[PDB]
Amino acid sequence: QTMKGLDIQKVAGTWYSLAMAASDISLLDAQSAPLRVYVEELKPTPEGNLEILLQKWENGECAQKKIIAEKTKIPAVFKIDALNENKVLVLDTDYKKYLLFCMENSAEPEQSLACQCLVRTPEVDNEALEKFDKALKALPMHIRLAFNPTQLEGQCHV
Amino acid sequence: IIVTQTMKGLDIQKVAGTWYSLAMAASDISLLDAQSAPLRVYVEELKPTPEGNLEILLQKWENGECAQKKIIAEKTKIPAVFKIDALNENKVLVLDTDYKKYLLFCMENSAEPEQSLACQCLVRTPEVDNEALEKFDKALKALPMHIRLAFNPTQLEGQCHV
Protein backbone atom coordinates (compact mmCIF):
# COMPACT_ATOMS: atom_id res chain seq x y z
CA GLN A 1 0.00 0.00 0.00
CA THR A 2 1.41 3.31 -1.22
CA MET A 3 -0.13 6.67 -2.03
CA LYS A 4 0.41 6.97 -5.76
CA GLY A 5 -0.97 10.53 -5.60
CA LEU A 6 1.49 11.83 -2.94
CA ASP A 7 2.55 15.46 -2.98
CA ILE A 8 5.35 15.55 -0.41
CA GLN A 9 5.34 19.34 -0.37
CA LYS A 10 2.01 19.42 1.50
CA VAL A 11 3.18 17.25 4.42
CA ALA A 12 5.49 19.98 5.73
CA GLY A 13 5.04 20.68 9.43
CA THR A 14 4.89 19.36 12.97
CA TRP A 15 3.49 15.87 13.46
CA TYR A 16 3.00 13.54 16.43
CA SER A 17 3.43 9.76 16.54
CA LEU A 18 -0.05 8.56 17.59
CA ALA A 19 0.45 4.83 17.07
CA MET A 20 3.27 2.47 16.14
CA ALA A 21 3.36 -1.21 15.12
CA ALA A 22 6.22 -3.53 14.23
CA SER A 23 6.90 -7.02 12.91
CA ASP A 24 9.32 -7.90 15.77
CA ILE A 25 8.51 -7.16 19.38
CA SER A 26 12.11 -6.10 20.10
CA LEU A 27 11.86 -3.29 17.55
CA LEU A 28 9.42 -1.39 19.80
CA ASP A 29 8.87 -2.76 23.28
CA ALA A 30 11.35 -0.88 25.61
CA GLN A 31 11.35 2.88 25.65
CA SER A 32 14.83 2.73 24.05
CA ALA A 33 13.96 0.07 21.43
CA PRO A 34 15.61 0.81 18.05
CA LEU A 35 12.43 1.74 16.14
CA ARG A 36 10.68 3.45 19.05
CA VAL A 37 11.17 6.86 17.42
CA TYR A 38 8.83 9.79 17.92
CA VAL A 39 8.32 11.97 14.85
CA GLU A 40 8.33 15.68 15.52
CA GLU A 41 8.55 17.28 12.09
CA LEU A 42 8.55 16.54 8.35
CA LYS A 43 10.54 18.91 6.12
CA PRO A 44 10.21 18.34 2.35
CA THR A 45 13.04 19.77 0.25
CA PRO A 46 12.76 21.78 -2.99
CA GLU A 47 13.97 18.80 -5.01
CA GLY A 48 11.31 16.48 -3.48
CA ASN A 49 13.40 14.77 -0.81
CA LEU A 50 12.25 14.60 2.82
CA GLU A 51 13.87 15.32 6.19
CA ILE A 52 12.29 13.41 9.07
CA LEU A 53 12.97 15.01 12.43
CA LEU A 54 12.45 12.65 15.31
CA GLN A 55 13.33 11.97 18.94
CA LYS A 56 14.35 8.79 20.72
CA TRP A 57 15.01 7.81 24.32
CA GLU A 58 18.69 7.00 24.72
CA ASN A 59 20.48 6.35 28.03
CA GLY A 60 17.52 7.69 30.00
CA GLU A 61 17.17 10.97 28.09
CA CYS A 62 15.58 12.37 24.96
CA ALA A 63 17.82 12.76 21.95
CA GLN A 64 17.01 14.35 18.58
CA LYS A 65 17.79 12.59 15.30
CA LYS A 66 17.35 13.74 11.71
CA ILE A 67 16.81 11.20 8.90
CA ILE A 68 17.36 12.25 5.31
CA ALA A 69 14.90 10.45 2.93
CA GLU A 70 15.63 10.47 -0.83
CA LYS A 71 12.92 10.33 -3.52
CA THR A 72 12.90 7.35 -5.88
CA LYS A 73 11.24 6.48 -9.21
CA ILE A 74 8.31 4.87 -7.32
CA PRO A 75 5.71 7.30 -5.98
CA ALA A 76 5.54 7.48 -2.14
CA VAL A 77 8.71 5.38 -1.71
CA PHE A 78 11.80 7.07 -0.25
CA LYS A 79 15.20 5.60 0.52
CA ILE A 80 17.11 6.09 3.76
CA ASP A 81 20.20 4.90 5.57
CA ALA A 82 19.27 4.95 9.25
CA LEU A 83 18.14 2.59 12.00
CA ASN A 84 19.30 -0.39 9.84
CA GLU A 85 16.42 0.55 7.48
CA ASN A 86 16.60 1.48 3.84
CA LYS A 87 13.05 2.38 2.81
CA VAL A 88 10.24 4.67 3.92
CA LEU A 89 6.79 4.11 2.35
CA VAL A 90 3.94 6.59 2.66
CA LEU A 91 0.78 4.48 2.68
CA ASP A 92 -1.78 7.29 2.84
CA THR A 93 -2.35 10.88 3.96
CA ASP A 94 -5.17 13.41 3.83
CA TYR A 95 -2.46 16.14 4.24
CA LYS A 96 -4.60 18.13 6.70
CA LYS A 97 -4.71 15.67 9.62
CA TYR A 98 -3.03 12.27 9.33
CA LEU A 99 -0.24 10.42 7.56
CA LEU A 100 0.51 6.67 7.59
CA PHE A 101 4.04 5.43 6.88
CA CYS A 102 6.24 2.38 7.23
CA MET A 103 9.99 1.90 7.44
CA GLU A 104 11.74 -1.34 6.50
CA ASN A 105 14.86 -2.93 5.18
CA SER A 106 14.33 -4.44 1.73
CA ALA A 107 16.65 -7.32 2.53
CA GLU A 108 14.55 -8.57 5.46
CA PRO A 109 11.18 -6.83 5.93
CA GLU A 110 9.97 -9.47 8.43
CA GLN A 111 12.73 -8.39 10.80
CA SER A 112 12.55 -4.65 10.22
CA LEU A 113 9.01 -3.49 9.42
CA ALA A 114 7.70 -0.67 11.60
CA CYS A 115 4.75 1.54 10.70
CA GLN A 116 3.26 4.65 12.29
CA CYS A 117 0.15 6.76 12.29
CA LEU A 118 1.10 10.46 12.46
CA VAL A 119 -1.27 13.34 13.27
CA ARG A 120 -0.62 17.10 12.98
CA THR A 121 -2.05 17.95 16.42
CA PRO A 122 -1.60 16.19 19.82
CA GLU A 123 -5.10 14.62 19.94
CA VAL A 124 -6.34 11.02 19.46
CA ASP A 125 -7.81 10.71 15.94
CA ASN A 126 -9.92 7.56 15.73
CA GLU A 127 -10.61 7.96 11.99
CA ALA A 128 -6.83 7.94 11.44
CA LEU A 129 -6.34 4.93 13.74
CA GLU A 130 -9.03 3.02 11.87
CA LYS A 131 -7.22 3.62 8.59
CA PHE A 132 -3.93 2.57 10.27
CA ASP A 133 -5.40 -0.71 11.55
CA LYS A 134 -6.99 -1.45 8.16
CA ALA A 135 -3.65 -0.84 6.41
CA LEU A 136 -1.61 -3.19 8.58
CA LYS A 137 -4.20 -5.98 8.61
CA ALA A 138 -2.19 -7.84 5.95
CA LEU A 139 1.15 -7.03 7.61
CA PRO A 140 2.87 -9.44 10.02
CA MET A 141 2.81 -7.24 13.13
CA HIS A 142 3.59 -8.59 16.60
CA ILE A 143 3.56 -5.35 18.63
CA ARG A 144 1.22 -2.35 18.48
CA LEU A 145 1.21 0.80 20.67
CA ALA A 146 -1.27 3.70 20.67
CA PHE A 147 -0.77 6.91 22.65
CA ASN A 148 -3.04 9.33 24.52
CA PRO A 149 -2.84 13.19 24.46
CA THR A 150 -0.62 13.41 27.61
CA GLN A 151 1.83 11.06 25.92
CA LEU A 152 1.66 12.91 22.58
CA GLU A 153 2.58 16.12 24.40
CA GLY A 154 5.13 14.56 26.73
CA GLN A 155 7.12 11.97 24.72
CA CYS A 156 10.38 13.53 23.57
CA HIS A 157 8.70 16.24 21.45
CA VAL A 158 9.70 19.92 21.10
CA ILE B 1 -14.81 3.03 33.77
CA ILE B 2 -13.98 -0.25 32.05
CA VAL B 3 -16.96 -2.60 31.76
CA THR B 4 -16.08 -6.26 31.44
CA GLN B 5 -17.97 -9.39 30.39
CA THR B 6 -16.62 -12.61 31.97
CA MET B 7 -17.38 -16.16 30.96
CA LYS B 8 -20.91 -17.31 31.74
CA GLY B 9 -20.90 -20.93 32.93
CA LEU B 10 -17.15 -21.30 33.46
CA ASP B 11 -16.18 -24.63 35.06
CA ILE B 12 -12.83 -23.85 36.65
CA GLN B 13 -12.04 -27.50 37.30
CA LYS B 14 -11.53 -28.06 33.56
CA VAL B 15 -8.76 -25.42 33.16
CA ALA B 16 -6.05 -27.33 35.04
CA GLY B 17 -2.66 -27.86 33.58
CA THR B 18 0.11 -26.20 31.62
CA TRP B 19 -0.54 -23.02 29.63
CA TYR B 20 1.63 -20.64 27.57
CA SER B 21 1.17 -16.89 27.29
CA LEU B 22 0.69 -16.42 23.56
CA ALA B 23 -0.42 -12.78 23.51
CA MET B 24 -0.88 -9.88 25.92
CA ALA B 25 -2.62 -6.54 25.83
CA ALA B 26 -3.02 -3.73 28.36
CA SER B 27 -4.87 -0.47 28.89
CA ASP B 28 -1.77 1.39 29.87
CA ILE B 29 1.49 0.93 27.79
CA SER B 30 3.74 0.92 30.84
CA LEU B 31 2.05 -2.28 32.13
CA LEU B 32 3.77 -4.31 29.39
CA ASP B 33 6.30 -2.24 27.40
CA ALA B 34 9.59 -3.52 28.95
CA GLN B 35 11.02 -7.01 29.73
CA SER B 36 10.71 -5.86 33.36
CA ALA B 37 7.25 -4.23 33.07
CA PRO B 38 4.94 -5.02 36.02
CA LEU B 39 2.41 -7.14 34.11
CA ARG B 40 4.84 -8.76 31.71
CA VAL B 41 4.17 -12.15 33.33
CA TYR B 42 4.32 -15.54 31.64
CA VAL B 43 1.85 -18.12 32.83
CA GLU B 44 3.07 -21.66 33.41
CA GLU B 45 0.16 -23.53 34.99
CA LEU B 46 -3.40 -23.08 36.26
CA LYS B 47 -4.34 -25.16 39.30
CA PRO B 48 -7.95 -25.03 40.46
CA THR B 49 -8.43 -26.18 44.06
CA PRO B 50 -11.17 -28.48 45.34
CA GLU B 51 -12.87 -25.49 47.06
CA GLY B 52 -13.05 -23.66 43.70
CA ASN B 53 -10.12 -21.31 44.19
CA LEU B 54 -7.33 -20.99 41.61
CA GLU B 55 -3.56 -20.94 41.86
CA ILE B 56 -1.72 -19.32 38.98
CA LEU B 57 1.94 -20.29 38.55
CA LEU B 58 3.90 -17.80 36.52
CA GLN B 59 7.28 -16.28 35.92
CA LYS B 60 8.62 -12.83 35.20
CA TRP B 61 11.89 -10.95 34.88
CA GLU B 62 12.70 -9.20 38.14
CA ASN B 63 15.98 -7.89 39.60
CA GLY B 64 17.88 -9.21 36.56
CA GLU B 65 16.59 -12.80 36.71
CA CYS B 66 13.56 -14.90 35.70
CA ALA B 67 11.62 -15.47 38.90
CA GLN B 68 8.83 -17.90 39.73
CA LYS B 69 5.66 -16.53 41.30
CA LYS B 70 2.50 -18.12 42.68
CA ILE B 71 -0.69 -16.03 42.71
CA ILE B 72 -3.59 -17.19 44.89
CA ALA B 73 -6.99 -16.35 43.37
CA GLU B 74 -9.96 -16.59 45.73
CA LYS B 75 -13.39 -17.40 44.35
CA THR B 76 -16.27 -14.94 44.35
CA LYS B 77 -19.97 -15.54 43.75
CA ILE B 78 -19.25 -15.06 40.05
CA PRO B 79 -17.39 -18.20 38.90
CA ALA B 80 -15.38 -16.25 36.32
CA VAL B 81 -14.24 -13.49 38.78
CA PHE B 82 -11.57 -14.08 41.42
CA LYS B 83 -9.94 -11.86 44.03
CA ILE B 84 -6.14 -11.58 44.12
CA ASP B 85 -3.58 -9.39 45.89
CA ALA B 86 -0.49 -9.52 43.69
CA LEU B 87 1.19 -7.47 40.94
CA ASN B 88 -0.72 -4.40 42.28
CA GLU B 89 -3.87 -6.11 41.00
CA ASN B 90 -6.95 -7.24 42.92
CA LYS B 91 -9.00 -9.21 40.36
CA VAL B 92 -8.61 -12.04 37.84
CA LEU B 93 -11.30 -12.18 35.17
CA VAL B 94 -11.79 -15.22 32.94
CA LEU B 95 -13.32 -13.99 29.69
CA ASP B 96 -13.60 -17.22 27.71
CA THR B 97 -12.15 -20.68 27.24
CA ASP B 98 -12.86 -23.83 25.25
CA TYR B 99 -10.99 -25.77 27.97
CA LYS B 100 -9.03 -27.86 25.48
CA LYS B 101 -7.01 -25.23 23.57
CA TYR B 102 -7.20 -21.59 24.73
CA LEU B 103 -8.19 -19.43 27.68
CA LEU B 104 -8.54 -15.64 27.77
CA PHE B 105 -8.15 -13.80 31.07
CA CYS B 106 -7.42 -10.41 32.52
CA MET B 107 -6.04 -8.92 35.70
CA GLU B 108 -6.92 -5.49 37.02
CA ASN B 109 -7.19 -3.30 40.04
CA SER B 110 -10.83 -2.33 40.63
CA ALA B 111 -9.71 1.00 42.16
CA GLU B 112 -7.99 2.05 38.91
CA PRO B 113 -8.91 -0.12 35.95
CA GLU B 114 -7.51 2.22 33.26
CA GLN B 115 -4.08 2.11 34.90
CA SER B 116 -4.11 -1.64 35.57
CA LEU B 117 -5.97 -3.79 32.99
CA ALA B 118 -3.81 -6.47 31.35
CA CYS B 119 -5.30 -9.41 29.44
CA GLN B 120 -3.73 -12.53 27.94
CA CYS B 121 -4.44 -15.23 25.45
CA LEU B 122 -3.27 -18.56 26.89
CA VAL B 123 -2.84 -21.79 24.90
CA ARG B 124 -2.23 -25.31 26.15
CA THR B 125 0.52 -26.12 23.63
CA PRO B 126 3.58 -24.07 22.52
CA GLU B 127 2.34 -23.01 19.09
CA VAL B 128 0.75 -19.92 17.58
CA ASP B 129 -2.98 -20.65 17.63
CA ASN B 130 -4.54 -18.19 15.20
CA GLU B 131 -8.16 -18.89 16.12
CA ALA B 132 -7.23 -18.25 19.76
CA LEU B 133 -5.75 -14.90 18.71
CA GLU B 134 -8.90 -14.05 16.75
CA LYS B 135 -11.04 -14.78 19.82
CA PHE B 136 -8.64 -12.69 21.95
CA ASP B 137 -8.96 -9.74 19.59
CA LYS B 138 -12.70 -9.96 19.49
CA ALA B 139 -12.87 -10.20 23.35
CA LEU B 140 -10.67 -7.04 23.45
CA LYS B 141 -12.82 -5.01 21.06
CA ALA B 142 -14.60 -3.06 23.80
CA LEU B 143 -11.62 -2.79 26.13
CA PRO B 144 -9.44 0.34 25.86
CA MET B 145 -6.12 -1.34 25.12
CA HIS B 146 -3.07 0.72 24.15
CA ILE B 147 -0.44 -2.05 23.81
CA ARG B 148 -0.67 -5.55 22.27
CA LEU B 149 2.10 -8.19 21.95
CA ALA B 150 1.93 -11.60 20.24
CA PHE B 151 4.72 -14.19 20.69
CA ASN B 152 6.17 -16.78 18.33
CA PRO B 153 7.00 -20.43 19.21
CA THR B 154 10.69 -19.67 19.93
CA GLN B 155 9.51 -17.05 22.39
CA LEU B 156 6.87 -19.43 23.86
CA GLU B 157 9.66 -21.93 24.60
CA GLY B 158 12.27 -19.33 25.51
CA GLN B 159 13.73 -18.89 29.00
CA CYS B 160 11.15 -17.25 31.32
CA HIS B 161 8.20 -18.29 29.13
CA VAL B 162 8.34 -22.07 29.96
Side-chain angles (χ1 to χ4, degrees):
Chain A
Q1 193 189 313
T2 46
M3 200 178 168
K4 209 295 191 191
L6 184 67
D7 175 9
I8 205 68
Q9 298 302 317
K10 287 192 316 190
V11 309
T14 290
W15 294 83
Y16 292 86
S17 294
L18 176 61
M20 296 175 185
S23 63
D24 288 26
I25 288 167
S26 70
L27 299 169
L28 291 181
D29 55 344
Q31 282 158 122
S32 71
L35 305 186
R36 189 105 162 234
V37 293
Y38 304 99
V39 179
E40 62 186 11
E41 201 178 354
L42 296 186
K43 307 176 87 172
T45 76
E47 281 309 299
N49 306 303
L50 180 65
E51 305 182 352
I52 307 176
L53 283 62
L54 58 79
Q55 304 219 209
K56 56 175 180 169
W57 192 251
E58 178 183 6
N59 187 35
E61 289 190 357
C62 298
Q64 289 181 305
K65 184 179 182 64
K66 177 197 282 194
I67 294 179
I68 304 298
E70 294 189 330
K71 75 186 179 202
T72 75
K73 277 91 152 192
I74 297 303
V77 179
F78 296 79
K79 287 176 176 171
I80 59 165
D81 185 49
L83 313 170
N84 209 357
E85 305 284 35
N86 71 353
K87 289 171 69 163
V88 168
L89 307 96
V90 179
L91 277 51
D92 189 34
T93 183
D94 70 350
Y95 300 104
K96 299 183 192 183
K97 288 177 197 175
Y98 77 88
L99 181 146
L100 309 185
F101 83 90
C102 300
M103 312 168 332
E104 64 181 349
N105 194 304
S106 65
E108 188 68 17
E110 315 56 64
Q111 297 296 316
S112 63
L113 181 66
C115 307
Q116 300 198 12
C117 173
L118 304 186
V119 286
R120 279 199 188 249
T121 62
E123 287 147 18
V124 174
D125 179 341
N126 290 308
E127 173 235 358
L129 290 170
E130 287 165 47
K131 287 170 179 285
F132 187 59
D133 293 326
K134 193 185 183 306
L136 288 35
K137 229 92 191 164
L139 297 176
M141 303 305 196
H142 293 87
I143 182 160
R144 181 192 181 279
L145 307 171
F147 303 108
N148 63 47
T150 293
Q151 291 165 332
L152 300 167
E153 293 175 14
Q155 283 177 147
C156 305
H157 199 287
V158 299
Chain B
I1 69 168
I2 300 177
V3 172
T4 60
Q5 174 185 6
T6 68
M7 183 186 180
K8 187 170 190 166
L10 174 70
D11 180 352
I12 201 70
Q13 300 298 150
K14 291 194 300 176
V15 312
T18 290
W19 295 86
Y20 302 83
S21 294
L22 176 59
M24 305 175 185
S27 54
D28 231 12
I29 293 163
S30 65
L31 288 163
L32 294 181
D33 82 328
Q35 162 204 124
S36 64
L39 265 285
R40 197 83 162 246
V41 291
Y42 307 101
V43 173
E44 291 169 293
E45 201 164 348
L46 295 181
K47 306 173 83 175
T49 74
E51 298 78 15
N53 304 300
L54 178 71
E55 316 185 320
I56 302 166
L57 295 198
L58 62 80
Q59 49 194 341
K60 78 177 311 295
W61 291 96
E62 68 179 328
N63 309 341
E65 168 59 1
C66 193
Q68 295 289 332
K69 293 192 184 275
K70 179 161 103 179
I71 297 179
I72 302 296
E74 298 179 9
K75 75 185 174 178
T76 72
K77 288 173 109 43
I78 313 301
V81 175
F82 298 80
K83 203 273 173 201
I84 60 163
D85 183 5
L87 308 173
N88 276 102
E89 304 287 34
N90 67 4
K91 288 183 179 177
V92 164
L93 309 178
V94 179
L95 308 184
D96 192 32
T97 184
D98 69 351
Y99 303 109
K100 294 182 206 69
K101 317 193 52 167
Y102 74 91
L103 181 146
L104 311 183
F105 83 96
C106 307
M107 293 162 158
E108 62 171 4
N109 195 303
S110 65
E112 55 263 337
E114 285 82 358
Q115 290 69 44
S116 66
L117 180 66
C119 305
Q120 303 199 1
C121 176
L122 302 182
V123 291
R124 281 194 182 269
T125 54
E127 308 201 72
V128 176
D129 179 339
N130 283 302
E131 283 293 283
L133 291 168
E134 292 196 339
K135 289 165 181 297
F136 184 57
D137 290 327
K138 147 188 205 165
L140 295 178
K141 195 178 313 294
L143 300 178
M145 304 315 212
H146 292 87
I147 178 164
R148 186 195 176 276
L149 309 170
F151 300 96
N152 65 41
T154 305
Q155 294 165 330
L156 298 180
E157 286 285 6
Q159 193 214 71
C160 217
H161 305 53
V162 154

